[PDB]
Design goal:
The complex is a heterodimer of chains A (216) and B (216). Chain A has 216 residues and is mainly beta. Chain A has two helices and 16 strands. The N and C termini of chain A lie far apart (63 Å). Chain B has helices at residues 26-30, 126-129, 187-191; strands at 17-23, 37-39, 65-66, 72-78, 88-91, 101-102, 118-122, 137-141, 149-152, 163-166, 179-182, 197-200, 205-208. Chain B contains three helices and 13 strands, in the order βαββββββαββββαββ. A four-stranded antiparallel sheet of chain B has the order 7-8-11-10, with no helix packed on it. Chain B has a three-stranded antiparallel sheet with strand order 1-4-3, with no helix packed on it. Classes of the chains: A mainly beta (216), B mainly beta (216).
């Protein structure tokens, strides 16, 4: 089969322009017209951006663009958005009932403004309570930089190995979300009194904490 | 225009076979045959599993097979395996510029648990309700697979007017966890009667409903 040729990255800048590459063969790019650019948001499922050249599907807003001088073919993106940083692949149909892809470019929109996660700490609810069990949370949205150190604070004490939390990632494209959870014993939760999450994001630190108060 | 539901997960064993679905409307999906599957795996430029349905993109093992009852489509791989975890994608075509893919699936076959996750609904607290702000968090703890789908519906109604998800990032126990983050403020939270989050899971599909309250 051999393969294809498109670069593993392409840096642009928030409201900039994008060129996206695809060297390929004389029966594909190099010879037929049956090319595509597909836009993963990353996690959702490809979904073509440019077809049949600069063949812009339903409500694929224009600033994208096919073109190729030959064997080798590209596509540009005039002025970025950041929804623009996604996964960009390229594909020329082949010989018959068959075609070929490759991966890269239009992945990197910096010009992206840096922000802070709006921690939100919650305790366990009723059910769980009625039910005899507890699971505590720290939600973390509104950050661009996704690379956060969250902490479990227990009556003002570094809790340790009963608390999960995982690689957040992009909300409506944009920026990320996280959430730590301290899984526990209401025994010990109903013991304690200070119940604090904390995030440290880029210097800056935000802490939240709950006391056996509320209702529920 | 888009509209293809394909199963969220699809269970790998060892030697075994697996099958899917994908589904939209009459029109396209049912008045006609259109839908065409893709191998996507751990970030690569997808393949071609079905190429019009009932024919395999040559150099494709014949285990994989496609199957609409007329309203929808399926797929089977007869003899599970390693080179089979992917994210399988599906398209009917469209109006010269529609052409729609359904979601994804995935697969498995090694040392692998096999278990059921744990959805959990904390609405809001006062602090938050108090001033101007809600959200509502529905977490999904330790699964085994985790390709769990999350729903938020209140007073009957489905929704995704108001929700983001936080991908099941691992709990070093090798099990799974993720969240859903729906934000209201106050207005819907109290302007409704009850809410809910629900989690489908490789034959599994457990749900929380929920309420509001006043709090004391």
């Amino acid at each position: 089969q051999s393969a294809l040729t498109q670069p593993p990255s392409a840096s642009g800048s928030l409201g900039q322009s994008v060129t996206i590459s695809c060297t390929g063969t004389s029966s594909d790019v190099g010879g037929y017209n049956y090319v595509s650019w597909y836009q993963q948001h990353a996690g959702k499922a490809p979904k073509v951006i440019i077809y049949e050249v600069n063949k812009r599907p339903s409500g694929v807003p224009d600033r994208f663009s096919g073109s190729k001088s030959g064997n080798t073919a590209s596509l540009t993106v005039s002025g970025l958005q950041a929804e623009d940083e996604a996964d960009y692949y390229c594909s020329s149909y082949e010989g018959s009932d068959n075609f070929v892809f490759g991966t890269g470019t239009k992945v990197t929109v910096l010009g992206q403004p840096k922000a802070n996660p709006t921690v939100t700490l919650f305790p366990p609810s009723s059910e769980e309570l009625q039910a005899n069990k507890a699971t505590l949370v720290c939600l973390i949205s509104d950050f661009y930089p996704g690379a956060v150190t969250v902490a479990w604070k227990a009556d003002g004490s570094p809790v340790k190995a009963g608390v999960e939390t995982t690689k957040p990632s992009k909300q409506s494209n944009n920026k990320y979300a996280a959430s730590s959870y301290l899984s526990l014993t209401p025994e010990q939760w109903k013991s304690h009194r200070s119940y604090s999450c904390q995030v440290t994001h880029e210097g800056s630190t935000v802490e939240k904490t709950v006391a056996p108060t509320e209702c529920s």
